[PDB]
């Protein structure tokens, strides 16, 4: 068993299975597009017999828009929170906001509520090698996951609003669900999730172009498509047939696939 | 002594001790005849010995000897090719091919030798060992000029990747030699691009070379019937090759892709968008996880935009995204490229607000980069200029130290956008339609910034000044006199020459007149140096020389010359102090001033010799033991001999001088007793002529000024005793010949302990010509003191002793107890 | 087949292995012992060194200075590099870093020699090596000193000089310190690979590092060619140490083994030494003195401070502060903390919980452990007299240790400890000999001792073993303890500095691949075992031999069965006769002659189509395809 870096989330990896001349590779969720705190998936020219992949589916421009909106809200003094359950996206947003505030040099507050976020921060700062190269290099200067934009007490929904950035992870009735009761009720008390609202969600999974790049790099004689919409995988399989004339598969749930091999 | 080497080699045991002896002989240097002998001895022992490692070492030593500059390697080349024909071991064969590389580099002129080397190289290329194949391919690449290209091209398909890398490197070397390449190499390299390994792909640079050589050449696609130029298909190759996962290969591909500026912009626009596999190549490059790849992509964008303006207009947005980049260096370089390509593009409100956003950032250097950008950027709407000004004023409030750069920005904004500014004049000056506004606070940063913008806008436009109030004109006059560089609308030499000529003509007066003239002239020279900074070098140089002459003259008129030696008393003596001062000033003349030629060094050393003679005279006067007189006189005669042998080519131009008269009397001085010789040299020194110092063409005095402690303060650097407190040192060094070696920082504790420090050559940095910055972190420690005390630090200019070099700065230190 | 050894040091190997169509440089291994001869570099110029006397020179005494009857070089310290001139370093393509200690002097080989290949290592080794290199460069450049003594290096002067300098070997090869720019240049060429990661070189050689267990990141390499395996052993530890436990199974069935990194002064027990060191510092603190512990920021200080905090918590002497001074002290501690995967199973169990691996982070949070980049960097303000200090280089020729021990040299109340088994402490104290300072030499050596490596060899049983000649001889300190003697049933040859060794292994068969159609071409026939023969074209790319389609004949025919078949076939003119020189039969059916003779055989067949077909059928009935 040999593992290869995936970069979908911290600790995510893709496995290369080999026995004799046989070779099977299964990746699950990955992404060619690097994250703000993670590296892109990399693999040699393994050229395996079979490849299993996901078919599910302006990043810097979206980041600029999100940062500009958050900056405008905090400059105006408005309070907006980001209710998100994903740990990887939450940590990426936390790193982005922390470095943005540090670069701007201002001292506006930003905190995170749930203790699970603190546990995730502890695991992240412990496991440096599974992150982006800037994190690894800046580790020499000082720890970057630690900052004045730390933990949240919030006087249990009694510390009032302000130029604040907060994170809540409900779920669907978990976490401090009273945050909505304390906040909102007016246009100024904005609450933005994926007075206005926009889709700040970042696509952790890569698009079809990333899958095309990976299959072009590895170049297996056969490919297997799972974990995605039916339309997406059908279109991707048709595009693979049109572009490469390389054998592929579209197995349904429980479908038995058999492949000949040359030992 | 080749016999010693021969017998030592013979006595040495063959298996082990021979290797050590040859290594020891190799480390020590060698001479031409010694090389010519030891090479034959090595060849004879190479024939005699049959071990692999020993023969390998002999081949390595042959290579080392071949690199000797003074040797004439002709027969040893013949013996080398002979043993090459006879050689069997592949490692030793590769070492001998290294020696052939050495000889080919040494002598690239002989055509017969070149063809002999290439034919024997291709003969030995039949060997199965990969190393000898690599060495032979290196020889083929190095040796060329008008079949070898086809031969190495056949070896492109070799199984060993190292041989393929050697082949492509040989092709690159051959191209560097300038030979005209073929076109079949393109498809061969295209085949090489599919190779698994990284060095082969990175080297296969070769397609860039062939694309540059024949960019207009038509090439047919193997599958598609359509015809595509070499430039475009090579561009597509590099585009879909950048997707490779080898980051070094990605950086190489991006860098060499930037060097291509002979391709149509339509194809670039097609391949840069997100909607073949060549789409979004630059999108992937700028989004790449390694900042090296992104920097290389930025450079490629710079070159291509300098080629095509439409592509630049298309790619502005991606550069704006790079202004949001998390790495600071990437942001800086992207901003610099945007500045480089701003001459044609014009921004929109989105671009302008995004650019002004990153200007808010805290780091000073990126803000300076934004300032450089805005100096050249275009703009369409007056509201863009208004936004620029408002964000710049916010920046003034945040970071006032950048005021000069922002004023430069507004200068360029006004000059390059005059018409677009003046509709915004009455709002910027806040002039009321009918009221008379209160006079704005002059010397304010923001108001000066606004005025600089307005005035630089008004330089071309004639309708602008009519909207100015009276106090605006008054402030215009104020700014114009104070900030002229921002706000828009030799008798001395010949005097110095004739003064020196006056001194040279009138030196023959009596001692009183000579002293008076010398005093007046040194005063005049000092005043000229103070008055004009250009001539300060020659002025201070001449002042030091004439002060040496004055000190020599005054010493010779002292009372002790007409009192017997027993009656002499050294408490009132001035000759010893005079000699000391002349010595120090001669050292200052020699080393402090830069640009001094040999014709000045001879006179400086002559004055030093006269000072040494005076020292000998006074020491003979004060002492009474014959033996110290004999020793001192012998040492002085040794110095005279050293001087006259050092400057043999200059004695005819020192007629009637002290050293000339000493040379005329040299045998008598050498033979005579200490009393007779000291008396005759004393009376000789009195009648010595005054040499005419030749003025250098250009000369500057060296000087340093410490600025990190500044003029200090009462505040002492408290710290525990015994431990060390580090003090920063900053100084501005000017016209120092070799500051990293000659300049030494010195710190004097308030006692006899005068610690000395040698700054490392790395810390010395050169911001501009004729000067040197010096950043040092000197470390100071001492035991406990009863109270805070002052510690002195000074710059010293070392030579081959040392002299003071700058004003002695001092700082207060308070080492607290344990 | 050929092994070149460059460094004569036992624990700092520098070896080059010529293996098939590739050559591997094993380790760099900077020899730091050379610096001991030079005068130390104080951070603040001490009066003692300035007033220190020179030494007589017939040919001019400023070149050398003498203290305590030992002449020292009064110039910048210089380092003994490996004998790199023996083999052209440009030729070699791969470098296999084993540990952060062995990768020292890598800038010299990467930059000066013109080496253009690749380098491999583990991530903790790379980071800790960067820390060590930058800190030593900082120590050298803090107080620059001129190269003011060169003439002493001549062999004549060396013979004229006493034993402490005459013992030095290859003084001419010594070099001044590299610069941080060269360090940045060298580390650019390195490639990061984790434990048990197979790396293929040009499709010919497989190389893999395995967990040595000595220090985190430290690895033992193996080299494989399927039918040939060469294993390289470096500093390893079987003790209950923090890193991931030493791997033993993977080194089995190894043809040639290379042994390096055995313990200096093997008699010392590290646990007892640590306990004694704790006792020494405890009594020093009880008397009110100060303890100086020169050591690297490596694993030694880590487990030392672990046992140390445990001991003082047991004894309740936690009042005194902890001072760890180094330019990369904070970085070293944080790097140790984050690298939790490379540690042992206990640490991995600990980090499964949210708590960090090591507990000194708790001390830092509670401020019971304190560290500073240097002395001047606010440590002076926060310094207190009764304390224990870890700082500087263990060679005592540079680093903050020089200033610290100069400060505390006079007072007998204070104490200085030694824990690094890499230098003779008597030589180290020689430039500082006239002192009342109490010095204790209690090194801690966690590497494998002689009995442990002997147990390892008896458990593995490799065919051959290679090691320096130092191991082959008993140590000079004892010269009588035959128990500390590496024992091997094979001869287990050795070498000296600049000694070239030829491997005894001479395996003459490599791997190849075959596609199924060639396999199906055979039709094996029972004999007693199966026999087969094929014929294919050889294709090789990237040292991967392949067989794909575009043989001798052994037709052992018994005489009696052949006679029976010939009689049954019905051919006319059959004559059988028994005469000398074997049986000879004349057949006039087609002018054919069959001759049978010992040690020979001749076959005659005409070109007639029918006769050819009959002969082919007859042979095919009793044809063995081999
Ligand atoms: Zn997933
Ligand atoms: Zn996922």
Tab-separated table of C-alpha atoms in Angstrom, chain B residues 63-386:
chain	number	residue	atom	x	y	z
B	63	UNK	CA	43.209	16.206	-16.110
B	64	UNK	CA	44.375	18.501	-13.308
B	65	UNK	CA	47.756	19.047	-15.007
B	66	UNK	CA	46.040	19.777	-18.334
B	67	UNK	CA	44.187	22.685	-16.682
B	68	UNK	CA	47.530	24.385	-15.857
B	69	UNK	CA	47.617	27.765	-17.600
B	70	UNK	CA	51.340	28.116	-18.319
B	71	UNK	CA	51.919	24.601	-19.656
B	72	UNK	CA	52.196	23.781	-23.379
B	73	UNK	CA	50.226	20.499	-23.618
B	74	UNK	CA	51.084	19.092	-27.064
B	75	UNK	CA	52.933	15.758	-26.720
B	76	UNK	CA	50.880	14.748	-23.669
B	77	UNK	CA	47.784	15.042	-25.881
B	78	UNK	CA	49.327	12.425	-28.192
B	79	UNK	CA	50.127	10.153	-25.248
B	80	UNK	CA	46.583	10.694	-23.926
B	81	UNK	CA	44.942	9.596	-27.177
B	82	UNK	CA	47.353	6.619	-27.311
B	83	UNK	CA	46.376	5.434	-23.818
B	84	UNK	CA	42.745	6.148	-24.789
B	85	UNK	CA	43.146	3.639	-27.613
B	86	UNK	CA	44.780	1.243	-25.124
B	87	UNK	CA	42.434	1.853	-22.148
B	88	UNK	CA	40.049	-0.908	-21.025
B	89	UNK	CA	38.399	0.130	-17.732
B	90	UNK	CA	35.298	2.277	-18.223
B	91	UNK	CA	35.766	4.515	-15.152
B	92	UNK	CA	39.370	5.302	-16.114
B	93	UNK	CA	38.144	5.798	-19.689
B	94	UNK	CA	35.614	8.381	-18.457
B	95	UNK	CA	38.346	10.151	-16.476
B	96	UNK	CA	40.530	10.291	-19.597
B	97	UNK	CA	37.538	11.683	-21.518
B	98	UNK	CA	37.418	14.368	-18.810
B	99	UNK	CA	41.067	15.069	-19.642
B	100	UNK	CA	40.029	15.333	-23.303
B	101	UNK	CA	37.364	17.862	-22.282
B	102	UNK	CA	40.095	19.790	-20.459
B	103	UNK	CA	42.430	19.752	-23.469
B	104	UNK	CA	39.608	20.745	-25.841
B	105	UNK	CA	38.718	23.709	-23.634
B	106	UNK	CA	42.417	24.617	-23.377
B	107	UNK	CA	43.167	24.591	-27.127
B	108	UNK	CA	40.062	25.138	-29.298
B	109	UNK	CA	42.017	26.435	-32.331
B	110	UNK	CA	43.725	23.351	-33.848
B	111	UNK	CA	41.257	21.848	-36.336
B	112	UNK	CA	43.228	18.612	-36.789
B	113	UNK	CA	43.309	18.098	-33.011
B	114	UNK	CA	39.557	18.808	-32.888
B	115	UNK	CA	38.691	16.197	-35.515
B	116	UNK	CA	41.031	13.673	-33.854
B	117	UNK	CA	39.188	14.244	-30.563
B	118	UNK	CA	35.738	13.884	-32.126
B	119	UNK	CA	36.590	10.707	-34.078
B	120	UNK	CA	38.171	8.999	-31.051
B	121	UNK	CA	35.183	10.210	-28.981
B	122	UNK	CA	32.670	8.627	-31.344
B	123	UNK	CA	34.853	5.498	-31.454
B	124	UNK	CA	34.710	5.140	-27.654
B	125	UNK	CA	31.002	6.069	-27.697
B	126	UNK	CA	30.404	2.454	-28.798
B	127	UNK	CA	31.147	1.420	-25.183
B	128	UNK	CA	28.201	0.147	-23.142
B	129	UNK	CA	29.024	2.203	-20.020
B	130	UNK	CA	26.719	5.209	-19.717
B	131	UNK	CA	29.355	7.514	-18.202
B	132	UNK	CA	31.788	7.350	-21.115
B	133	UNK	CA	28.834	7.925	-23.457
B	134	UNK	CA	27.951	11.084	-21.505
B	135	UNK	CA	31.552	12.314	-21.647
B	136	UNK	CA	31.810	11.604	-25.392
B	137	UNK	CA	28.555	13.479	-26.035
B	138	UNK	CA	29.921	16.406	-24.019
B	139	UNK	CA	33.014	16.414	-26.257
B	140	UNK	CA	30.832	16.315	-29.384
B	141	UNK	CA	28.742	19.216	-28.094
B	142	UNK	CA	31.781	21.329	-27.202
B	143	UNK	CA	33.697	20.644	-30.443
B	144	UNK	CA	31.834	21.527	-33.624
B	145	UNK	CA	31.360	24.139	-36.398
B	146	UNK	CA	31.495	23.518	-40.160
B	147	UNK	CA	27.214	14.916	-39.467
B	148	UNK	CA	27.869	15.221	-35.724
B	149	UNK	CA	24.373	16.693	-35.217
B	150	UNK	CA	22.776	13.660	-36.871
B	151	UNK	CA	24.981	11.289	-34.838
B	152	UNK	CA	23.984	12.834	-31.506
B	153	UNK	CA	20.357	13.024	-32.691
B	154	UNK	CA	20.435	9.260	-33.239
B	155	UNK	CA	21.479	8.917	-29.584
B	156	UNK	CA	18.415	10.878	-28.409
B	157	UNK	CA	16.541	7.551	-28.404
B	158	UNK	CA	19.000	5.914	-25.975
B	159	UNK	CA	17.471	3.972	-23.101
B	160	UNK	CA	19.522	5.622	-20.334
B	161	UNK	CA	18.019	8.995	-19.270
B	162	UNK	CA	21.452	10.325	-18.257
B	163	UNK	CA	22.673	9.875	-21.839
B	164	UNK	CA	19.589	11.732	-23.094
B	165	UNK	CA	20.277	14.627	-20.700
B	166	UNK	CA	23.883	14.675	-21.921
B	167	UNK	CA	22.646	14.757	-25.529
B	168	UNK	CA	20.341	17.716	-24.941
B	169	UNK	CA	23.045	19.562	-22.974
B	170	UNK	CA	25.470	18.920	-25.846
B	171	UNK	CA	22.887	20.377	-28.235
B	172	UNK	CA	22.546	23.459	-26.014
B	173	UNK	CA	26.339	23.858	-25.878
B	174	UNK	CA	26.554	23.494	-29.672
B	175	UNK	CA	23.839	26.141	-30.083
B	176	UNK	CA	25.825	28.370	-27.707
B	177	UNK	CA	28.763	27.932	-30.102
B	178	UNK	CA	26.447	29.360	-32.781
B	179	UNK	CA	26.113	26.524	-35.302
B	180	UNK	CA	22.981	26.530	-37.469
B	181	UNK	CA	20.635	23.805	-36.237
B	182	UNK	CA	18.352	21.509	-38.223
B	183	UNK	CA	14.569	21.108	-38.009
B	184	UNK	CA	14.279	17.313	-37.542
B	185	UNK	CA	15.460	17.803	-33.928
B	186	UNK	CA	12.064	19.368	-33.123
B	187	UNK	CA	10.070	16.144	-33.559
B	188	UNK	CA	12.797	14.144	-31.782
B	189	UNK	CA	12.584	16.489	-28.785
B	190	UNK	CA	8.778	16.298	-28.993
B	191	UNK	CA	9.145	12.535	-28.578
B	192	UNK	CA	11.436	13.212	-25.600
B	193	UNK	CA	8.754	15.340	-23.890
B	194	UNK	CA	6.769	12.184	-23.019
B	195	UNK	CA	9.707	10.819	-20.972
B	196	UNK	CA	8.946	9.866	-17.369
B	197	UNK	CA	12.024	11.503	-15.860
B	198	UNK	CA	12.333	15.194	-15.051
B	199	UNK	CA	15.799	16.313	-16.192
B	200	UNK	CA	15.174	15.057	-19.742
B	201	UNK	CA	11.886	16.975	-19.968
B	202	UNK	CA	13.411	20.149	-18.498
B	203	UNK	CA	16.302	19.985	-20.971
B	204	UNK	CA	13.945	19.252	-23.890
B	205	UNK	CA	14.793	24.386	-23.667
B	206	UNK	CA	15.768	22.685	-26.946
B	207	UNK	CA	12.323	23.176	-28.488
B	208	UNK	CA	12.470	26.795	-27.306
B	209	UNK	CA	15.830	27.152	-29.090
B	210	UNK	CA	14.537	25.648	-32.332
B	211	UNK	CA	11.344	27.754	-32.138
B	212	UNK	CA	13.432	30.917	-31.688
B	213	UNK	CA	15.672	29.947	-34.617
B	214	UNK	CA	12.839	29.351	-37.134
B	215	UNK	CA	9.581	30.784	-35.727
B	216	UNK	CA	8.018	31.493	-39.134
B	217	UNK	CA	8.700	27.932	-40.357
B	218	UNK	CA	5.617	25.982	-41.432
B	219	UNK	CA	5.162	22.582	-39.758
B	220	UNK	CA	2.403	20.032	-40.497
B	221	UNK	CA	0.459	18.327	-37.727
B	222	UNK	CA	0.881	14.512	-37.942
B	223	UNK	CA	-2.878	13.946	-37.536
B	224	UNK	CA	-4.569	17.198	-38.592
B	225	UNK	CA	-4.118	18.371	-42.179
B	226	UNK	CA	-3.976	22.052	-41.166
B	227	UNK	CA	-0.630	23.854	-41.259
B	228	UNK	CA	0.710	25.550	-38.124
B	229	UNK	CA	3.846	27.650	-37.696
B	230	UNK	CA	6.668	26.292	-35.529
B	231	UNK	CA	6.124	29.138	-33.058
B	232	UNK	CA	2.456	28.317	-32.392
B	233	UNK	CA	2.832	24.540	-32.079
B	234	UNK	CA	5.849	25.042	-29.794
B	235	UNK	CA	3.762	27.487	-27.736
B	236	UNK	CA	1.017	24.877	-27.391
B	237	UNK	CA	3.611	22.238	-26.474
B	238	UNK	CA	4.958	24.404	-23.644
B	239	UNK	CA	1.382	25.274	-22.614
B	240	UNK	CA	0.268	21.678	-22.113
B	241	UNK	CA	3.718	20.768	-20.756
B	242	UNK	CA	3.334	23.296	-17.890
B	243	UNK	CA	0.606	20.977	-16.520
B	244	UNK	CA	3.404	18.498	-15.609
B	245	UNK	CA	3.833	17.833	-11.896
B	246	UNK	CA	7.587	18.541	-11.734
B	247	UNK	CA	7.857	22.029	-10.246
B	248	UNK	CA	11.422	22.663	-11.468
B	249	UNK	CA	10.233	21.720	-14.958
B	250	UNK	CA	7.250	24.065	-14.509
B	251	UNK	CA	9.518	26.985	-13.540
B	252	UNK	CA	11.839	26.242	-16.475
B	253	UNK	CA	8.889	26.018	-18.881
B	254	UNK	CA	7.363	29.297	-17.695
B	255	UNK	CA	10.703	31.150	-17.819
B	256	UNK	CA	11.568	29.945	-21.329
B	257	UNK	CA	7.964	30.576	-22.392
B	258	UNK	CA	8.350	34.214	-21.368
B	259	UNK	CA	11.337	34.552	-23.714
B	260	UNK	CA	9.011	33.905	-26.685
B	261	UNK	CA	7.685	37.179	-28.150
B	262	UNK	CA	7.142	36.258	-31.826
B	263	UNK	CA	3.632	34.766	-31.702
B	264	UNK	CA	0.201	36.130	-32.632
B	265	UNK	CA	-1.803	37.554	-29.730
B	266	UNK	CA	-5.090	35.951	-30.865
B	267	UNK	CA	-3.758	32.476	-30.049
B	268	UNK	CA	-2.529	33.696	-26.654
B	269	UNK	CA	-5.976	35.135	-25.894
B	270	UNK	CA	-7.575	31.849	-26.984
B	271	UNK	CA	-5.294	29.730	-24.798
B	272	UNK	CA	-5.351	31.961	-21.694
B	273	UNK	CA	-9.127	31.910	-21.153
B	274	UNK	CA	-10.927	29.254	-19.107
B	275	UNK	CA	-13.152	28.179	-22.028
B	276	UNK	CA	-7.962	21.270	-26.409
B	277	UNK	CA	-5.998	21.027	-23.169
B	278	UNK	CA	-4.099	24.296	-23.676
B	279	UNK	CA	-6.930	26.421	-22.251
B	280	UNK	CA	-6.102	28.344	-19.083
B	281	UNK	CA	-2.359	27.650	-19.121
B	282	UNK	CA	-1.602	31.002	-17.490
B	283	UNK	CA	-4.665	30.506	-15.269
B	284	UNK	CA	-3.061	27.323	-13.931
B	285	UNK	CA	0.335	29.024	-13.679
B	286	UNK	CA	-0.904	31.988	-11.651
B	287	UNK	CA	-3.032	29.708	-9.455
B	288	UNK	CA	-0.078	27.327	-8.944
B	289	UNK	CA	0.798	26.475	-5.350
B	290	UNK	CA	4.502	27.413	-5.635
B	291	UNK	CA	5.390	31.105	-5.651
B	292	UNK	CA	8.379	30.401	-7.933
B	293	UNK	CA	5.989	29.219	-10.654
B	294	UNK	CA	3.794	32.282	-10.119
B	295	UNK	CA	6.804	34.638	-10.313
B	296	UNK	CA	7.940	32.980	-13.550
B	297	UNK	CA	4.389	33.322	-14.908
B	298	UNK	CA	4.480	37.016	-13.923
B	299	UNK	CA	7.710	37.474	-15.905
B	300	UNK	CA	6.161	35.703	-18.897
B	301	UNK	CA	3.126	37.993	-18.658
B	302	UNK	CA	5.500	40.978	-18.549
B	303	UNK	CA	7.398	39.984	-21.708
B	304	UNK	CA	4.256	39.047	-23.649
B	305	UNK	CA	2.451	42.245	-22.607
B	306	UNK	CA	5.497	44.269	-23.682
B	307	UNK	CA	5.029	42.498	-27.018
B	308	UNK	CA	1.224	42.695	-27.331
B	309	UNK	CA	-1.075	45.380	-25.848
B	310	UNK	CA	-4.365	43.523	-26.428
B	311	UNK	CA	-3.103	40.568	-24.390
B	312	UNK	CA	-2.079	43.029	-21.666
B	313	UNK	CA	-5.604	44.495	-21.621
B	314	UNK	CA	-7.016	40.973	-21.372
B	315	UNK	CA	-4.656	39.980	-18.551
B	316	UNK	CA	-4.984	43.105	-16.339
B	317	UNK	CA	-7.598	41.337	-14.194
B	318	UNK	CA	-5.302	38.400	-13.424
B	319	UNK	CA	-2.536	40.816	-12.414
B	320	UNK	CA	-5.075	42.518	-10.132
B	321	UNK	CA	-5.730	39.086	-8.609
B	322	UNK	CA	-1.965	38.713	-8.114
B	323	UNK	CA	-2.110	41.998	-6.210
B	324	UNK	CA	-4.232	40.005	-3.721
B	325	UNK	CA	-1.605	37.202	-3.656
B	326	UNK	CA	-0.664	35.902	-0.226
B	327	UNK	CA	3.102	35.921	-0.926
B	328	UNK	CA	4.624	39.406	-0.635
B	329	UNK	CA	7.307	38.879	-3.304
B	330	UNK	CA	4.687	37.768	-5.837
B	331	UNK	CA	2.697	40.936	-5.123
B	332	UNK	CA	5.801	43.125	-5.505
B	333	UNK	CA	6.841	41.571	-8.800
B	334	UNK	CA	3.300	41.643	-10.235
B	335	UNK	CA	3.043	45.339	-9.324
B	336	UNK	CA	6.402	46.047	-10.980
B	337	UNK	CA	5.303	44.272	-14.172
B	338	UNK	CA	1.979	46.157	-14.157
B	339	UNK	CA	4.004	49.368	-13.894
B	340	UNK	CA	6.179	48.155	-16.782
B	341	UNK	CA	3.152	47.517	-19.015
B	342	UNK	CA	0.922	50.421	-17.936
B	343	UNK	CA	2.034	52.639	-20.857
B	344	UNK	CA	-0.835	51.483	-23.116
B	345	UNK	CA	-3.598	50.006	-20.930
B	346	UNK	CA	-6.238	52.075	-19.174
B	347	UNK	CA	-8.094	50.923	-16.070
B	348	UNK	CA	-11.752	50.932	-15.013
B	349	UNK	CA	-13.387	51.722	-11.668
B	350	UNK	CA	-13.207	48.067	-10.523
B	351	UNK	CA	-9.481	47.904	-11.298
B	352	UNK	CA	-8.875	51.273	-9.639
B	353	UNK	CA	-10.669	50.427	-6.378
B	354	UNK	CA	-8.936	47.032	-6.193
B	355	UNK	CA	-5.538	48.693	-6.751
B	356	UNK	CA	-6.220	51.347	-4.111
B	357	UNK	CA	-7.355	48.587	-1.718
B	358	UNK	CA	-3.980	46.792	-1.661
B	359	UNK	CA	-2.289	50.191	-1.185
B	360	UNK	CA	-3.854	50.238	2.317
B	361	UNK	CA	-1.618	47.282	3.357
B	362	UNK	CA	0.879	47.706	6.184
B	363	UNK	CA	4.186	46.589	4.635
B	364	UNK	CA	6.153	49.614	3.453
B	365	UNK	CA	7.805	48.041	0.384
B	366	UNK	CA	4.551	46.948	-1.285
B	367	UNK	CA	3.158	50.447	-0.667
B	368	UNK	CA	6.252	51.858	-2.378
B	369	UNK	CA	5.588	49.445	-5.246
B	370	UNK	CA	2.002	50.730	-5.506
B	371	UNK	CA	3.440	54.250	-5.569
B	372	UNK	CA	5.725	53.305	-8.469
B	373	UNK	CA	2.705	51.758	-10.205
B	374	UNK	CA	0.454	54.810	-9.845
B	375	UNK	CA	3.139	57.095	-11.311
B	376	UNK	CA	2.657	55.409	-14.706
B	377	UNK	CA	-0.961	54.135	-14.588
B	378	UNK	CA	-3.636	55.562	-16.883
B	379	UNK	CA	-7.200	56.542	-15.943
B	380	UNK	CA	-10.379	57.464	-17.855
B	381	UNK	CA	-12.817	59.134	-15.448
B	382	UNK	CA	-12.140	62.112	-13.197
B	383	UNK	CA	-13.858	60.131	-10.422
B	384	UNK	CA	-11.014	57.626	-10.706
B	385	UNK	CA	-8.569	60.438	-9.936
B	386	UNK	CA	-10.820	61.513	-7.054
